[PDB]
Amino acid sequence: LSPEQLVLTLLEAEPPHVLISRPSAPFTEASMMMSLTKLADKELVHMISWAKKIPGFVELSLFDQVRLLESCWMEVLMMGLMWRSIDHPGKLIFAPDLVLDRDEGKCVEGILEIFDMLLATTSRFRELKLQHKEYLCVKAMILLNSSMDSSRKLAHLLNAVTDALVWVIAKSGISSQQQSMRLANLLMLLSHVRHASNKGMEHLLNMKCKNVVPVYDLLLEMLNAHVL
């Protein structure tokens, strides 16, 4: 399987556009956390399907598939958020019916912090002109590189996706020197995604402990499974 064919299969694994079915209106504190958690829960279901479409993922031990997903889900959700927000400076496009501004992120304590982190990282990707195919590889890598027999398979897969991103960059036809600089600049942003992911988990966990957010089984499981 060539890098191009692997990239194509990722495009095919792309989850569908998700909406929360909320009538356009101003955001308060309760309606905002209710929307974010409801959105995350719906996206989590599609994320599972997405992963299973990654060549080899279902070949891993069930223990690995679970640990990889339980640990990277928030980062993957945030990577998706940033790619959707790329062509909309200043806004976080969580969903078509859930578009938020920085100020609106003041209606919830501790969230403005993270919105700023996400907006800056999004702005950073925009400055680099992140291409769709690059986004695909990076997102796949986030899932396969969250690994804090089946192991060999994993390293093999991670390496395949890495080979794919190098390929995407090589096709842009830029100099070799600028291909390495671009490869590094993109990979260096993952540290920031991981960082904004850790804060987002801390915040959500706090909201959960306060029973301020409705019960969403898949989301509750992913939260506890990960917190623990």
């Binding site: 599972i48 997903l69 898949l218």
Partner: peptide, 9 residues
């Protein structure tokens, strides 16, 4: 939940 979605389509 996660495990059942990982084992079914």
């Amino acid at each position: 939940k996660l495990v059942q979605l990982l084992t079914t389509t």
